[PDB]
Amino acid sequence: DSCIQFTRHASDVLLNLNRLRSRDILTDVVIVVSREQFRAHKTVLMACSGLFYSIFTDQLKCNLSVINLDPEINPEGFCILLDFMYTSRLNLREGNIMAVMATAMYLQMEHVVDTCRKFIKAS
Amino acid sequence: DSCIQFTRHASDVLLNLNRLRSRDILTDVVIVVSREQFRAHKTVLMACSGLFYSIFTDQLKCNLSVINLDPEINPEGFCILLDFMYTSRLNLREGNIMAVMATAMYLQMEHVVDTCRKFIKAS
């Protein structure tokens, strides 16, 4: 086409979606990870994760307001990944990289799994 | 912080949100523009438009599944702007620039209003 493009548009959209999350505006699901609860927008979870994409395209699970993750999933690893979904920023540290990679593999977040594998290989 | 960043994350998120829109997945509102109907995600509309942000943060309008725009709003201008919201791409043409600018001013999409003003000034 003959379209023009606004370079910062996608980043600005994501920034506003994170502002909505921080204010708990139009969040439509709670992700339960052991004792911890995380509120989010199903569409953003689907856009970032192969696991959530599969869950919320399911004709029955699409209507659930609560999703319980596998008890092996670490709440901090999930929190770091949820922050990444809404910001593009990953808080990858020596102390959390194993839990982050395992959570990213479960959530099917291929690019995060790739950088964790590379950072582990370097050490 | 000590975060790393995935450059393409915001663009990939927006691409997936547009895929959900194209398949009518988890759309939660219909925007009525004269005789025309447009399905969308309230969160994406809010993230892109000062008008939708104000509408869906309203304690009563947040729960509406149908929003009717001012009858002066042109459906094609709205369609072009809705496509821009989900893609960062604006189909700005000689034949539509006046309707696009007027719709962007009504929707409070400041960056679109700015490029329309500049393109009009050049001609």
Binding site: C3, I4, Q5, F6, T7 | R89, L90, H111, T115
Partner: peptide, 4 residues
Amino acid sequence: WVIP
């Protein structure tokens, strides 16, 4: 704004 750019030409993509």
